[PDB]
Design a protein around this ligand. Structure first.
Ligand code: NDP
Lengths: 210, 263, 63, 123, 120, 123, 485
């Protein structure tokens, strides 16, 4: 079953790329999970196609987020997650966005999405052009920085204490009574896992000649 | 990052000979190295005093009389900075115990009325004689005795008389003690109380304030009628401070037709 | 004539989240607390025992 | 190079006081694995007064520097250097030192020495 | 239990599942043109093993395009490996498909009059 | 969430510099017009002209920014700050993040020369 | 015993400064203390092998340091305010008033290039280039040129020893000085066909030397007799020189014979490699001569009123005058701090990001692993602040400006870990030959050992008890060190 099903998912996604060649750059499958690799100016048409086709009706934004790799020129990748509650299927959509350039917002289509978009905004600084009420959520109001970002340290920059003099809490640069001790320094120096086998069906890898 | 705007340096020597090195940058978590004992820190000036003093990490020894007036002094300092131990003016041994490891030590034990237990003579000259005899006994550097304005040795008032008496007795037994005399005080001429505490912390730590009487009086002189109409030696310039002015501190048809009202 | 007791380990000295950026490392930075009840989920056993200790403190005050 | 030190929310002192360092991690001399010697580490040089100091109660290693336990891993030196000058930091690229290739034979362990032996293998 | 920690015949590599992990089958814009024109290891369209690699390498360099690969594709290619064999688009696929009962009688958990049904 | 909050605007990215200049212009007008509300609202000690000269000097900080999209993010961040300040979302201890130099002088020995830095090893 | 498990450790990549090779180490720190050093690999200079003294002298890094400035009252120091000591120095400068050629500024063994630049700038804006090094016979120019860097460097590369054919050492023991160099020599001698002979004390090497003598006459006889065939025959020889002959007052006559032989023989000296080679014993004395840190001929004649010790650990009681103002700047207490009127706590090599130059000429930075403990400061900033209390305003106040000034002295010191060749080696051998011709007579003083002990030198190994028991455990008097009986 499961071998047949992952080989079926491969073919469905090959069809999805062939139906929209202008917008879809790649697709990758890894164990009954489908990721669609999409340009940032290509978000809105692909998401309308995912909402609207009868073969492809996902209807429901579950969760979206970014992830930074600082080693790439386009820093953040913005990943979307959908759930066709009709066809009982999940699909994933990745785009990219630098710190300063945007990605357009799907809150015109998906009504739940706006709250997710401003969450990923505060954690990552990734912009959603076309979005009412883009501002911070679930951090401090005067907070300077974006926390879930690799240049930002663990304990942050500031701390809070009650100054007696001003009769108010004051915000001060960071001083610890016990320093943070990461134990990541001390990982393995041998490669921990091998390369591993593949789950590609025989129909979708390139033929050898003769 | 927070800096020692407290200190002049990083390595300091006291008079008695102990070597004190500040650790880290100024801030709550650091330690300046000084140990200070503030008599009367439950009160109104001592609260601002060891607010400033335990801000950077001087280990403040707070002698307390009542257990409930002292509690808000716990949040002004780090782990191990502010230290509470009970004492009474009557029991010698508690005064002896409270100044064992102090580098500097101040009293602001001052009461404006007689009790059934202490008159003016009992808290101002005689308590100060007691604790400053202990300071002479342990050879603590930098003793500071805050006094009152108009502290005359012989006066019709008993309060001012005994403030002068306390000054004379503490100058007699310790020659190196410094006695500071502030103005009237308005926390929230008169002087603002954060200015008195800023002046006192700048008295606390430097050299060349030794055996010097200080007058801490604000910029412009007032009368009581002028104050109520507004409601309705060495000065500050020795220690590079400008006191705040009392007056600036003193505060511290058609649309309705086009709205809807009955819904 | 007010008191406060600090229940849990996240409410005294930061706790599990002690090295997080958006956290106060215990309410000692804000309010002056008189009894601590430690435990990350300190059992109703331990919380009530902290209250009994605090009542002893309140009676020995006799304000 | 767009100057991103004004947008990341970091304070000015982190861009105009502290020096940072690119390095590839060296191979450990203790154990013979080489897995952690491929990624490029971005790490901050310590500051004089605010590194670490002993606490008076227990002896806790309290710090005042806040980037002391942060490191980054990059894929290439060029990505690391573009990120380092994009955030507006002053780097120092430390170039890696590899081993020299030298042909080994097990038959080197015994040859006919015509003169003095000058050496006795043991195996 | 014991068959995991027997002392005779347990090489670790047979019961090993952390290393025999699958890899992400990532597909470029270009390797799908390769799937449309070279063929597949199931159905190859390539002879001449020496000139095979030469016909492969221009597609690997960016010779032909994908819209050109779709225009040059036969109807058998399009109805075999892009679309389904009946010319239909494939359905969004689900692992274990779920067929629904509706329990209605006295085995229901709410009688008629309450609005909750008890599907299965 | 269909409707937005009160003073919000849909974040939208201009393609020219002059339109951005018009938008930052209208934005400074909004801050400067709402400056009498902030003294009543956050219960500050001081005068409305000090709020106004701070709003001015916080736009002095980014006067010479060249890149268009960095001006764009800077406008979006400024509008978010206006949005928080004009309502009661910020409190009076985060509004006074903006004025650390005004409230109190910390004490003597602000170091200026190398000697005063060096007696407490650059603080 | 190990006190810290290796997941607790913080790794830091620095340079060793105890030896002249400048080998790569790896400082492991818990955070105020330093646990160990371990050789980071380098292809040329050390090839994963590190010295014994390099490794076990982290013990002296935490036992007898200076954590406060001290002022001498008379037979006893007291510790002091920083301003107290640094105003004492200015008041004694105004009292003694050395107008010129009376401010001696001697450096020492393991000191940063940037601290030497700060000191030299302060002396030359003071008005006195009495600017000398710590070695005996250091008061003069070291009988070989500060000019033409190939005079005092290791000119064939350290990698070039693998290509060597037949080399001879003069006045040195490479088993003691630069012990990693002996691993290179023995590796070369075992892999290929080599010929060693030696002029100096009878050394026990790992490898096989040939003895030649104990006299400069024995030197000249050996260079004339049979090695004008060997070194002339050889494809890639090298002639290699200790710095223990620059110690000798008769050094120049010893440079004459060897420079005349290198100028005569075209195989030791040609286009692509130079084969006149010297060793150093320090990380600084090969980098001090890059700056020009040397006294003049006029400076050697006077007696100083105000002596500066920067490191400077092997000074004698006779080397400083009795009335002198003798201020020490170092990182731990030593013989050099015992003479002082003011000591100034400086940061050791662990606690500062410093530039160091080896014998090959590689400029290499260390990384600061921990802060200077208690009240020690960085070495050049102390000079930068003592300058302000004098009349000298040093033009820099930032470390990048130190880097730019350091480029101005020589820009092969802001270019790190590159080795450049020299086109001037042919000219430099002649220019190093002409100077000492006839200036001094070669006396018959026998060639002594350069260091009496390996394990106790350079102001850290004297303080560590590890060296203090490892010197007496390896004395080769006992039966356990000797191979026989
Ligand atoms: N206008 C003013 O305020 C002026 C005040 N001064 C002087 O400055 C100092 C501080 O000023 P101020 O805030 O007004 O004074 P306080 O209100 O602080 O005086 C009360 C403090 O002193 C303690 N105190 C008084 N008597 C005793 C005693 N027998 N035993 C133990 N503690 C005692 C009190 O103990 P407890 O906490 O238990 O009550 C309390 O800590 C005083 O000495 C005052 O004389 C100078 C000129 C004018």
């Amino acid at each position: 079953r499961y071998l047949q099903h992952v080989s079926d998912l491969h073919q469905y996604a090959k069809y999805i790329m062939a139906a929209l060649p202008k917008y879809i750059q790649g697709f990758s499958v890894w164990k009954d999970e489908l990721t669609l690799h999409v340009a940032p100016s290509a978000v809105i048409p692909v998401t309308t196609f995912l909402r609207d086709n009868t073969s492809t009706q996902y209807k429901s934004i579950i969760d979206i987020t970014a992830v930074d790799y600082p080693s790439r020129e386009n820093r953040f990748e913005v990943v979307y997650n959908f759930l066709s509650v009709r066809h009982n299927s999940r699909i994933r959509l990745k785009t990219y966005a630098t710190e300063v350039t945007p990605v357009p917002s799907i809150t015109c289509l998906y009504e739940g999405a706006n709250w997710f978009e401003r969450e990923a905004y505060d954690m990552y600084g990734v912009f959603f052009e076309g979005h009412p009420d883009l501002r911070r959520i679930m951090t401090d109001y005067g907070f300077e920085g974006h926390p879930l970002r690799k240049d930002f340290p663990l304990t942050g920059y500031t701390e809070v204490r009650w100054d007696e003099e001003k009769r108010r809490v004051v915000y001060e640069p960071l001083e610890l009574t016990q320093a943070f001790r990461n134990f990541s320094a001390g990982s393995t120096a041998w490669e921990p896992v091998g390369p591993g086998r593949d789950d590609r069906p025989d129909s979708f890898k390139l033929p050898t000649p003769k | 990052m927070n800096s020692f705007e407290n200190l002049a340096q990083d390595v300091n020597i006291t008079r008695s000979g102990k070597t004190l090195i500040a650790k880290g940058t100024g801030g709550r978590s650091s330690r300046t190295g000084y140990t200070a004992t503030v008599f009367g820190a439950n009160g109104f000036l001592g609260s601002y005093l060891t607010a400033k003093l335990a801000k950077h990490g001087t280990t403040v020894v707070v002698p307390y009389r009542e257990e409930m007036a002292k509690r808000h002094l716990k949040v002004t300092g780090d782990l191990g900075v502010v230290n509470f131990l009970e004492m009474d003016l009557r029991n010698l041994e508690s005064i002896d115990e409270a100044v064992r490891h102090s580098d500097i030590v101040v009293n602001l034990i001052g009461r404006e009325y007689e009790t059934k237990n202490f008159n003016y003579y009992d808290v101002h000259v005689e308590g100060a004689r007691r604790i400053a005899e202990a300071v002479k006994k342990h050879n603590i550097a930098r003793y500071i005795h805050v006094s009152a304005f108009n502290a005359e040795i012989d006066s019709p008032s008993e309060f001012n008389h005994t403030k002068g008496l306390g000054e004379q007795v503490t100058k007699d037994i310790v020659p190196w003690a410094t006695i500071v005399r502030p103005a009237p005080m308005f926390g929230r001429n008169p002087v603002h109380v954060i200015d008195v505490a800023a002046a006192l912390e700048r008295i606390c730590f430097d050299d060349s304030t030794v055996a010097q009487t200080f007058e801490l009086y604000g910029p412009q002189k007032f009368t009581q009628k002028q104050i109520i109409d507004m409601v309705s030696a060495k000065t500050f310039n020795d220690l590079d401070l400008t006191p705040m002015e009392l007056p600036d501190l003193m505060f511290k048809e058609n649309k309705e037709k086009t709205f809807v009202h009955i819904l | 004539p007010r008191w406060v007791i600090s229940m849990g380990s996240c409410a005294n000295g930061g706790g599990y989240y002690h090295f997080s950026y958006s956290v106060v490392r215990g309410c000692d930075r804000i309010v002056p607390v008189d009894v601590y009840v430690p435990g990350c989920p300190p059992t109703s056993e331990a919380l009530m025992y902290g209250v009994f200790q605090l009542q002893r403190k309140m009676r020995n005050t006799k304000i | 190079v767009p100057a991103h030190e004004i947008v990341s929310g970091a304070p000015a002192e982190l861009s105009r006081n502290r020096v940072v360092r690119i390095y590839q991690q060296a191979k450990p001399a203790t154990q013979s694995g080489e897995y952690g010697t491929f990624a490029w580490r971005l790490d901050w040089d310590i500051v004089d007064v605010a590194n670490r100091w002993e606490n008076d109660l227990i002896g806790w290693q309290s710090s005042g520097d806040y980037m002391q336990a942060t490191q980054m891993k990059f894929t290439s030196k060029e990505s690391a250097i573009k990120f380092a000058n994009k955030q507006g930091w002053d780097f120092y690229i430390q170039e890696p030192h590899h081993r020299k290739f030298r042909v080994k034979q097990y038959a080197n362990n015994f040859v006919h020495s015509y003169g003095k032996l000058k050496h006795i293998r043991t195996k | 239990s014991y068959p995991t920690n027997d002392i005779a015949e347990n090489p670790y590599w047979k019961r090993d599942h952390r290393r025999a992990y699958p890899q992400t089958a990532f597909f470029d814009q270009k390797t799908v043109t390769g799937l449309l024109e070279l063929g597949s290891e199931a159905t190859p369209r390539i002879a001449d093993g020496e000139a095979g690699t030469k016909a492969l390498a221009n597609i690997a360099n960016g010779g032909v395009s994908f819209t050109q690969a779709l225009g040059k594709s036969s109807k058998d290619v399009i109805y075999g490996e892009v679309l389904t064999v009946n010319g239909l688009p494939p359905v969004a696929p689900t692992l274990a498909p779920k067929q629904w009962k509706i329990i209605e009688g006295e085995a229901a958990i709410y009688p008629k009059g309450y609005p909750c049904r008890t599907f299965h | 969430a269909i409707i937005a909050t009160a003073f919000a605007e849909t974040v939208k990215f201009s393609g020219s510099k002059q339109e951005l200049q018009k938008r930052t212009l209208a934005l400074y007008r909004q801050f400067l017009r709402g400056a009498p509300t902030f003294a009543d609202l956050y219960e500050v000690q001081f005068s409305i002209p000090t709020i106004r000269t701070k709003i001015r000097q916080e736009f002095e900080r980014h006067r010479f920014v060249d890149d268009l999209s960095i001006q764009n993010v800077l406008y979006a961040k400024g509008h978010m700050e206006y949005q928080e300040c004009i309502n009661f979302w910020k409190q009076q201890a985060q509004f006074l993040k903006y004025f650390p130099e005004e409230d109190d002088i910390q004490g003597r020995h602000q170091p200026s020369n190398f000697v005063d830095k060096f007696l407490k090893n650059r603080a | 015993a190990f006190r810290a498990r290796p997941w607790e450790l913080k790794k830091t990549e620095s340079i060793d400064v105890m030896d002249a090779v400048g080998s790569n180490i790896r400082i492991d720190s818990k955070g105020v203390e330093v646990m160990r050093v371990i050789p980071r690999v380098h292809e040329d200079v050390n090839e994963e092998w590190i010295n014994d003294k390099s490794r076990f002298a982290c013990d002296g890094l935490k036992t007898q340091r200076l954590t406060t400035p001290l002022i001498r009252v008379g037979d006893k120091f007291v510790n002091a305010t920083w301003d107290d000591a640094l105003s004492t120095i200015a008041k004694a400068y105004q009292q003694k008033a050395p107008k010129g050629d009376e401010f001696k500024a001697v450096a020492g063994a393991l000191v940063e290039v940037e601290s030497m630049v700060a000191l030299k700038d302060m002396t030359n804006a003071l008005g006195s280039e009495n600017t000398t090094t710590d070695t005996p016979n250091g008061n003069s120019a070291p009988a070989h040129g500060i000019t033409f860097r190939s005079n005092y460097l290791f000119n064939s590369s350290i990698a070039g020893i693998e290509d060597a054919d037949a080399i001879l050492l003069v006045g040195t023991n490479p088993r003691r000085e630069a012990a990693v160099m002996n691993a290179r020599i023995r590796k070369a001698w075992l892999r290929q066909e080599l010929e060693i002979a030696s002029v100096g004390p009878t050394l026990d090497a790992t490898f096989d030397v040939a003895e030649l003598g104990n006299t400069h006459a024995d030197l000249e006889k050996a260079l004339s007799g049979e090695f004008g065939e060997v070194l002339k025959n050889a494809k890639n020889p090298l002639i290699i020189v200790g710095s223990g002959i620059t110690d000798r007052e008769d050094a120049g006559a010893f440079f004459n014979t060897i420079g005349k032989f290198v100028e005569s023989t075209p195989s030791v000296l040609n286009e692509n490699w130079n084969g006149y080679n010297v060793l150093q014993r320090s990380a600084s004395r090969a980098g001090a001569y890059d700056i020009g840190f040397t006294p003049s001929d006029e400076a050697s004649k006077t007696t100083p009123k105000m002596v500066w010790l920067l490191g400077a650990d092997e000074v004698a009681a006779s080397d400083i005058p009795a009335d002198a103002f003798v201020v020490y700047q170092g990182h731990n207490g030593d013989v050099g701090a015992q003479f002082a009127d003011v000591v100034l706590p400086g940061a050791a090599y662990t606690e500062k990001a410093g530039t160091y130059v080896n014998t090959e000429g590689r400029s290499q930075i260390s990384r600061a692993a921990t802060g200077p403990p208690g009240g020690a400061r960085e070495d050049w900033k102390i000079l930068r602040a003592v300058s302000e209390y004098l009349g000298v305003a040093l033009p820099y106040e930032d470390a990048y400006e130190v880097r730019d000034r350091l480029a101005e002295i020589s820009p092969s010191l802001v270019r790190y870990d590159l080795v450049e060749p020299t086109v001037f080696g042919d000219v430099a051998v002649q220019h190093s030959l002409v100077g000492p011709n006839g200036s001094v007579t070669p006396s018959s003083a026998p060639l002594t050992e350069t260091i009496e002990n390996f394990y106790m030198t350079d102001s850290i190994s004297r303080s560590s008890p590890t060296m203090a028991k490892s010197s007496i455990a390896f004395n080769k008097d006992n039966k356990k060190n000797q191979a026989f009986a």
